[PDB]
Design a protein around this ligand. Structure first.
Ligand SMILES: *[C@@H]1O[C@H](CO[C@@H]2O[C@@H](C)[C@@H](O)[C@@H](O)[C@@H]2O)[C@@H](O[C@@H]2O[C@H](CO)[C@@H](O[C@@H]3O[C@H](CO)[C@@H](O)[C@H](O)[C@@H]3O)[C@H](O)[C@H]2NC(C)=O)[C@H](O)[C@H]1NC(C)=O
Ligand SMILES: *[C@@H]1O[C@H](CO)[C@@H](O[C@@H]2O[C@H](CO)[C@@H](O[C@@H]3O[C@H](CO)[C@@H](O)[C@H](O)[C@@H]3O)[C@H](O)[C@H]2NC(C)=O)[C@H](O)[C@H]1NC(C)=O
Ligand SMILES: *[C@@H]1O[C@H](CO)[C@@H](O[C@@H]2O[C@H](CO)[C@@H](O)[C@H](O)[C@H]2NC(C)=O)[C@H](O)[C@H]1NC(C)=O
Ligand SMILES: *[C@@H]1O[C@H](CO)[C@@H](O[C@@H]2O[C@H](CO)[C@@H](O)[C@H](O)[C@H]2NC(C)=O)[C@H](O)[C@H]1NC(C)=O
Ligand SMILES: *[C@@H]1O[C@H](CO)[C@@H](O)[C@H](O)[C@H]1NC(C)=O
Length: 192
């Protein structure tokens, strides 16, 4: 028998409809051939294959992990387990998935309890994409931003109001692949 060594890269992927290979794992020069299995919180479909090795009697196994690409998987871990009767213990190889996609946006920092004459409250335009977003843009459903709302990069500062107002905000985010956007209505009364 022969002790074979192995590798594993990460096959970068876009947002195609079909299930494509997102991670490869390979054990070259096995005798006998090695056993390759995958383990992770988000299992899919592993497709294995093998070609003759270098020294007569050996075999190199090449297994790829196929899955239907999706935004929440970017950054997640996938582990390949190469087990063979010649190692001290089953060897473990881990890859760091990668998926490019348009920006998914949302706005936080608003508790329906906004009243007249309060202190400066600021909202953040939460956005998760790959690769990182290149530009942020604030505007209103009416066109230009009201005078009490001054834009600050990826955040919008809301100053004190003298009289009640209404305005649905829009955060247009642009990264290297596209440009998306969120919506959001905000109110300020008097009450107590
Ligand atoms: C901010 O807007 C509110 C109302 O907000 C409401 O929802 C928004 C998304 C828009 O669709 C608005 O058009 C809509 O009003 C203003 O106060 C609202 O005024 C309207 C009419 O002036 C009130 O209509 C009432 O409807 C109820 C039943 O739904 C009837 O019982 C009443 O008789 C009356 O017809 C509406 O009730 C009232 N909304 C609230 C929550 O009180 C508000 O004036 C505006 N801000 C400022 C500073 O003017
Ligand atoms: C897979 O690898 C990627 C990058 O190779 C990892 O992304 C990295 O995520 C960490 C934490 O989530 C980021 O580190 C933090 O950076 C900020 C700087 O903004 C710093 O303030 C923090 O103290 C911390 O160091 C890191 O920026 C980010 N890498 C890149 C290139 O953006 C990802 O976590 C890996 N995924 C898994 C499942 O291991
Ligand atoms: C694993 O993938 C291989 C190819 O990587 C599949 O082989 C294909 O087989 C289909 C029919 O089943 C053929 O139409 C293709 O030409 C083959 N593709 C290649 C690249 O050879 C194989 O079917 C897959 N294994 C399993 C068990 O599904
Ligand atoms: C995801 O994979 C990374 C490696 O890319 C893991 O990082 C290891 O963390 C352990 C314990 O924290 C360390 O002993 C190792 O040194 C780290 N690996 C490297 C190469 O530095 C991480 O544990 C994994 N996390 C998840 C959630 O899967
Ligand atoms: C968002 O910003 C991009 C970049 O300039 C622009 O082309 C696009 O028209 C904007 N989208 C909307 C809905 O305003």
């Amino acid at each position: 028998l022969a002790k074979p060594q192995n590798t594993a890269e990460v096959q970068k992927v876009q947002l195609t409809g079909e299930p494509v290979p997102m991670a490869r794992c390979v054990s070259t020069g096995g005798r006998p051939p090695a056993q390759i299995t995958w383990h992770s919180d988000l299992g899919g479909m592993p497709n294995t294959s093998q070609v003759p090795g270098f020294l007569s009697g050996t075999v190199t196994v090449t297994s790829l992990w196929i899955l239907v690409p999706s935004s929440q998987v970017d950054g997640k871990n996938v582990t390949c387990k190469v087990e063979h009767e010649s190692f001290e213990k089953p060897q473990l190889l881990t890859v760091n998935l990668t998926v490019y996609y348009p920006p998914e946006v949302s706005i936080s920092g608003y508790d329906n309890n906004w009243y007249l004459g309060q202190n400066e409250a600021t909202l953040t335009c939460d956005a998760r994409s790959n690769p990182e977003p290149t530009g942020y843009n604030w505007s209103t459903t009416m066109g230009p931003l009201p005078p009490f709302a001054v834009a600050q990069g990826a955040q919008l500062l809301i100053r004190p109001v003298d009289k009640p107002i209404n305005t649905t905000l829009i955060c247009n985010v642009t990264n290297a692949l596209g440009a998306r956007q969120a919506e959001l209505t905000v109110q300020v009364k008097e009450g107590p």
